[PDB]
Every structure is written in structure tokens, then in C-alpha cells.
Amino acid sequence: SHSMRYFYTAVSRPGRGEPRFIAVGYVDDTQFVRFDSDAASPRGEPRAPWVEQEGPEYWDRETQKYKRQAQADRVSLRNLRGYYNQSEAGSHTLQRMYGCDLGPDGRLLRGYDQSAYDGKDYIALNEDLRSWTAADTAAQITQRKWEAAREAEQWRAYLEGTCVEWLRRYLENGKETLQRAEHPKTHVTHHPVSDHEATLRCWALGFYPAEITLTWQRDGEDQTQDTELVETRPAGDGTFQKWAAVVVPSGEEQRYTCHVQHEGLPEPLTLRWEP
């Protein structure tokens, strides 16, 4: 129903040069903050209007936390290289994602924290937020180190407390946009390949949030096998786009219906090519 998520990417650079630390924060599908250690004088920066007037202390607090995170990740990246017997000549990637979800009732549903090394699962907090699952023997070292300081309790405290409190404050500050779904604007276009065949492309435009289902049916039967379904993509203005296309014989376009389900629609839509 609603969520706040942070995403960390730490990339070591070979031999000399410290790593590149980038963090972004999201409420649902809206980014609100970015931090890039490569900046001139790097600091947390607003990426959404509803955090811009939070005041300098808020932003000095975030910036200091970001900077300390980047220093931590630099040691972490050296530790990880040692766990896997990796030389300094190579670039490696440490990723972390954590956040909290609210349910339909507006209240805490789950917390999560997940880490990956070179694009593969490394270690994850279990959903009870009280222990970890390690993907390999290296990650079991990390787990033991985190257990030594009993770090699950502070993650739980943050995820079930600070994360939820601040998610609800961001959701209030940005109620005008964050709590208003934008229904997809939908239409069907017609593209001949020959006089005997045409592509029917069903469009969904300007919607929010990103979650959507687009489907072609032929005489009411699901044409999942013959459907070219493009991945949902950002329009660049905070809304999203998707289309689904099917190749039909000429003269039979009316047997084909497109179906779109979305949060901003009170019930699934049904449309067909209108020549």
C-alpha cells in the first residue's frame, strides 16, 4: 500500500581511488533523495518537493549519516575482497536495499534489509527482523559479526519505528501527489505489417503508481503467448507507461480486446481498436 525504501550501491575502483557510493531513497515509486560520494562537496539532496523545506539540520543530519555510511562501505568492500580472495585490481559492487511497508490499514506490515555482492544475494534479514539468512560461507562471517553486536534489534527498531514514523510524515507532506493515483490514459493503435496482418498496440500512459496489468484477449481467451508486452517505463514526469501488442489478421481486429487493471481505475478497463 505504501513503502519507504533506501538503495545503496558501493563500487570499488581498481588499485587507487576510493569507491563510488550512491544512495537513493524512495516513497513508493517517487524518489525523494540522492547522495553521490563523487560530488564536489557531497551531501544528501532533495529529489522531491515534499522534502525541500525540511530545514538545514535535517539535511546536515542526513549528509553526515551518508558520509559515515560511505566510509563504512569502503572498509566493507575490502573485507569482502578478503572473504573471496580477490585482488585489488578488480572492481566489485556492494548493494544494500532496506525499507518498510504499510498495509491497507495504513499501518506497519513488514520491514526488510537485503545485501548483494557482485549482483548476487549475500545476506538478508529474515522477516521476523530478528536474525539473518546468509547465502554462503563468507556471508556467515558477516552474520557472526552482526550477531556479535546484536545488530538485529537496532535494525528492527529502525524498520518498525523510525522508518514507519518518517514514511507517514513524508506521505503527509506529499499527500497531494503521493496519495493520489493517476489512472492510465488508454488507447489502441493499428499498425499494418502487410494487407493480411496488423499489429494492435494497446497503450497505457501517464499512470501512477507503476503497478499495472495489461492483457490482450481473443474472443475472451488470454493471448499471453502471442503478446509482445514491453516493460513498464518512466515517462520522466513521475508517471509511467506500458504497452502490449498482438499481430492479428486483417478483418479480425474486433475479436481482440485489451484489458487494463490499475489502482486508479475503479474496475478493470476494456477497450478495442476503434478505426
Binding site: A23, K65, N79, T142, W146, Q154, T162, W166
Partner: peptide
């Protein structure tokens, strides 16, 4: 806001 980076290195 960010989780305070008092959690440990990997």
C-alpha cells in the same frame, strides 16, 4: 530518513 550507520561493516 537514513538508518544511522552505527551498524557494522560487512
Amino acid at each position: 530518513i537514513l538508518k544511522e550507520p552505527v551498524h557494522g561493516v560487512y
